[PDB]
Ligand binder design. Sequence first.
Ligand SMILES: C[S@@+](CC[C@H](N)C(=O)[O-])C[C@H]1O[C@@H](n2cnc3c(N)ncnc32)[C@H](O)[C@@H]1O
Ligand SMILES: C[S@@+](CC[C@H](N)C(=O)[O-])C[C@H]1O[C@@H](n2cnc3c(N)ncnc32)[C@H](O)[C@@H]1O
Lengths: 188, 188
Amino acid sequence: MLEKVYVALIHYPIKGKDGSIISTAVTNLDVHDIARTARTYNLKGYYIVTNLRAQQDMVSKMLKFWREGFGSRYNPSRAESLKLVKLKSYLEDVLEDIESVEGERPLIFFTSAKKRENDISFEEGRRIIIETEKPVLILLGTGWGLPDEILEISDYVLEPIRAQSDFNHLSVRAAAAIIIDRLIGENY
Amino acid sequence: MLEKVYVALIHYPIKGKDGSIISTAVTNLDVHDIARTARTYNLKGYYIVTNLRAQQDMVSKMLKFWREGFGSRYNPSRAESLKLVKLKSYLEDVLEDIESVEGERPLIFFTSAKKRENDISFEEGRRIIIETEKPVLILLGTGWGLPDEILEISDYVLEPIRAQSDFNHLSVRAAAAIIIDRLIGENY
Ligand SMILES: C[S@@+](CC[C@H](N)C(=O)[O-])C[C@H]1O[C@@H](n2cnc3c(N)ncnc32)[C@H](O)[C@@H]1O
Ligand SMILES: C[S@@+](CC[C@H](N)C(=O)[O-])C[C@H]1O[C@@H](n2cnc3c(N)ncnc32)[C@H](O)[C@@H]1O
């Protein structure tokens, strides 16, 4: 059900340009942007996943500015949307947290512009979320996309958005928005 | 039809916090982000509308870096998506440009998180785009939203995304993504 859906923005492990594994910087706008989308569709949590202590520090400081500091008193909803945000160092820590919260490890939905074998449609994904009592975790990449090691542990790969177009390389913010709208939509 | 749809990001006239009319800075990521969304869904053009010469200069320089300069040789598709981008000083200049291109002034679709009287659903909007031979222009706001003077000249107001939610204050990048997916979707 729609009150048990999570999203995670992955910064490590991430594919580099030579796809080697890299660890990306967190772009500040990604935190605010995807938090607002998650909040709008009543998702349970938004995880920012990064093993870079400099990034963890920047995100933590930013979070308390907007959640506790001056920022929390001149927005309203920066802070409302940002309450959903949790920082974690690794995907495994995300999985462990959801298991603690939900009593159960989540179904993992891999996302990619690049067509994979054995994927599901968004209609098929919506059906799963409707019919399941399991928590669902939507994974979003940075850099040059989510790596094979994460693909290997994903339960489902959602088909690419606009797979038959001549161009479908969306930002992660635009992709997240569309993915969440297709899966949750105007259902309350 | 889907090969005659435009999007414009409005920075002036825009509602300020006291909603007074203000002129907003163009956030660089908005140019790249919404260009990719427009390109993915095969929209005809993406207008960046700003009457601030400092903003027009920053955007122009950025455009040629990615379209002509070094940027054009180490992406592929930054430059592909950015080809859709046109800078204009005023909404009127956008309308005038589309009239020159299409032989006809466009139908204007106003967008807002805030519920208005006399709006259309996305289903109703999709129908218009399917059945029309007129160009369509989707307007997106910055700051605290599109002002009444722009509302007054809009042919249609699309209903808010997630109007019945307790929170629907999306970023313009996330909103644009969802609006475009709802109107165009997986239609080729
Ligand atoms: C490759 S990353 C980096 C993209 C870009 N450089 C940016 O500024 O965000 C984009 C991420 O968004 C998601 N994404 C982008 N396009 C998508 C599509 N067409 N279908 C499904 N997911 C997509 C995937 O999760 C992907 O890992
Ligand atoms: C008010 S502006 C500024 C929002 C935010 N400060 C940002 O960083 O983008 C957001 C714009 O995105 C569009 N928008 C946002 N939420 C929307 C919604 N729920 N339904 C339709 N359009 C929306 C509107 O065009 C609006 O003018």
